[PDB]
Structures are given as C-alpha cells and as structure tokens.
Amino acid sequence: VASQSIIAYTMSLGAENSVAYSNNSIAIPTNFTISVTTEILP
C-alpha cells in the first residue's frame, strides 16, 4: 500500500563530487560528444 501526498524537504544543490586532484595527475578526454541545445529569447 502506498499513496501520493505533500512532502517538504531541504533542497539539494547538486550531486556531491570530489575531484581526484594530485600534483602530477592530469585527466584528458579520449573522445568527444557533439550536442545541440535550444536557447529561447523574447
């Protein structure tokens, strides 16, 4: 048994991430993606 109801919550700002930084490590993309995005202006 389950049912829809109003909830309240503290909003999330985004997913958590820690960057793997080190003073001799670099990350380089081996591939790419081409992406199309709409921007709408009055």
Binding site: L13, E16, N17, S18, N23
Partner: protein, 339 residues
C-alpha cells in the same frame, strides 16, 4: 545580485481591521491585486537572479584533503569546517561589512511584545502589513555553491565549465593561463616560487583592505539602505492627512457617522493607495536595475570564473589569468587575478 523580497497586504496597509473602510476599497476594484501581483513578480525574480549567478555548476565539487596547489595559498578563500556556516575567511569579512536591516527570518512576537516595539521600526513596518520574505537559497547554500565553483576552478581550471571536471596540477593550469595571455609558459615555471609569493601577498592585501574600510562595499549596503528607506517612507505616509480631518481611521469612525465619515475615508484610501502605486513603481524600477546587475554578475561568473577572458578590463584590470567568486549579502565579490 538581488534586493529584499518585500510583500504588502493592501487592506492592512490602507486600513487594517476596519470593515467600514474595507467596503470602500472595493470601489477601486483590482488596484490592490495588481500591486500584490507586481511585488510577487519582483519577489519571485530575486531567487531567479540568485540561481542564475551562483547555480552555474552541475555538481558540488570538494577540494582534496591535501591543500597544496603548487605553492599558491587559497587558505583564506576556501571554506573552513570550524565555523557554523561553512563560509571562507574573506566571505566572513564581507558578511560583516554589510549590515542587514531585516534578514526576513521568523519573528516569534516575543520581540514585538514590550519595549523593543517602541525602539524598533522593523516591528512597526510588520504591524502595517509590510513584510520582508526570506530568499530561497540561504547564506549557507550560496556559500556552498561558491565553494563548488571555487573547488572546481583550482582543481580543474575551465574544464568543469565545458564538460566534466578534469584534474590538472595547479602550476600547469596557471601555465596554460600564461600561454592564454601570450606569455610563453616557460616564464611561469622559471618564476613559479615568485609568482606564488606575489599571489599570496596580493590575497593578504585584500583581507587587510576589507578589515580596514567599510566604504568599498557601498554597492551592496546602498541596496539594503534603499529598501529600508522605501519601507520607512511608506510607513511614514500613514501619518499624512491628504485633506481629511485626521490621519487615523479609529478617530474618523469614533467621531463621525457613515454619511460623512465615508467622505473622509475616501481621501485617506485615495492617498494611501497612491502611496502604494508610487512604492511599487520605485520597486519595479529598482528590480530592473538589479536584474541588469545580476545578468552582468552571471556573465562574469561564466566568462571570468569558468574560463579566461580576452575582454579588456572585463575580468579585473590587466591581462586576465583567473577569478574567484565570494558570496556577500545580496551580492557577489569577484577576486579577479591578473598579470
């Protein structure tokens, strides 16, 4: 970036808790709900402005446990766990150099009962149907967004703006910058310990400058002051008479009867309602002037923090290397770094 999210209740402002005036306000029609709709339009936009300046980052980035970045010393711009709100050291200067007249948080009447309501004008604004609403993003959340924009910048340069964050050693990121301003990267590595000392000294001068004068944050304090001046002017406008026998409805209703009392009340409604049409016009004009600043601040966030700028004098004075955002009450401070 934003200004105080005010709201007004026109029945309480124009003539609260008198039915004898409420029944005359309706002769004018929707002039109240147009003003409530206009002020709600502004109040919803302040959270859009705060979202578009700070929420530029996909993910909440954390800096590594070992705080070594090629000798550059970010210790006063990064957050420290020890404070209740996880603001940086320089954000804690800025948060104190601007004094908020009313933050908009809860007021449990225990202040507004007794003597403080005679000594306080904010409680007297509340009693006249004028209120300040809180922002959606708290000063912890804005500081958290700022710590993610800053952690991304030092651990990954522009790459977290264009795609996923890609780590690169800070001295090589700064070398990629040097190439960007047309100074070949060997000039950085041959001077790295000098360049670090120069930056670490320049960051030290900002702490002292912000500890030494208040007048530099005038652009933020002036916004708080113009909001507070407007709600103070709007509550003083209750004391005017507009050609009526009194400025107080309780006197007009205690001293007259309906057939000529309604002739005094028409003057006070017409005056008070004009006193709102003016306030809402000043706020709409202020709201547009602030937006034109929040869109500039978002444009500097994208083009100075998430990138490196060729625009002359856009991202500080000099040839731009990089910039760090810091949150301030109703605003943003950019620490633009330049060669």
């Amino acid at each position: 970036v934003s200004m105080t999210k005010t709201s007004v209740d026109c029945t309480m402002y124009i003539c609260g808790d008198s039915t004898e005036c409420s029944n005359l306000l309706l002769q004018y029609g929707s002039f109240c709900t147009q003003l409530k709709r206009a002020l709600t339009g502004i109040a919803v936009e302040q959270d859009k402005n705060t979202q578009e300046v700070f929420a530029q980052v996909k993910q909440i980035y954390k800096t590594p446990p070992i705080k070594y970045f090629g000798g550059f010393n970010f210790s006063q711009i990064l957050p420290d766990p020890s404070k209740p709100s996880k603001r940086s050291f320089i954000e804690d200067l800025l948060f104190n150099k601007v004094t908020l007249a009313d933050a908009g948080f809860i007021k449990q009447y225990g202040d507004c009962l007794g003597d403080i309501a005679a000594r306080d004008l904010i409680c007297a604004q509340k009693f006249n149907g004028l209120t300040v609403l809180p922002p959606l993003l708290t000063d912890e959340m804005i500081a958290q967004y700022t710590s993610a924009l800053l952690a991304g910048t030092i651990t990954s340069g522009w790459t977290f703006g264009a795609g996923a964050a890609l780590q690169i050693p800070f001295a090589m990121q700064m070398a990629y910058r040097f190439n960007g301003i047309g100074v070949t990267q060997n000039v950085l590595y041959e001077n790295q310990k000098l360049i670090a000392n120069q930056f670490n000294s320049a960051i030290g001068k900002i702490q002292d400058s912000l500890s030494s004068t208040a007048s530099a944050l005038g652009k933020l304090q002036d916004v708080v002051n113009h909001n507070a001046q407007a709600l103070n002017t709007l509550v003083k406008q209750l004391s005017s008479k507009f050609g009526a026998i009194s400025s107080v409805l309780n006197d007009i209703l205690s001293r007259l009867d309906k057939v000529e009392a309604e002739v005094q009340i028409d003057r006070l409604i017409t005056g008070r309602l004009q006193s709102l049409q003016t306030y809402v016009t000043q706020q709409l004009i202020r709201a547009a002037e602030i937006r034109a600043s929040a869109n500039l601040a978002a444009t500097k966030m994208s083009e100075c923090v998430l990138g490196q700028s060729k625009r002359v004098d856009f991202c500080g004075k000099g040839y731009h290397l990089m910039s760090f955002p810091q949150s301030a009450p109703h605003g943003v401070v950019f620490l633009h770094v330049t060669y």
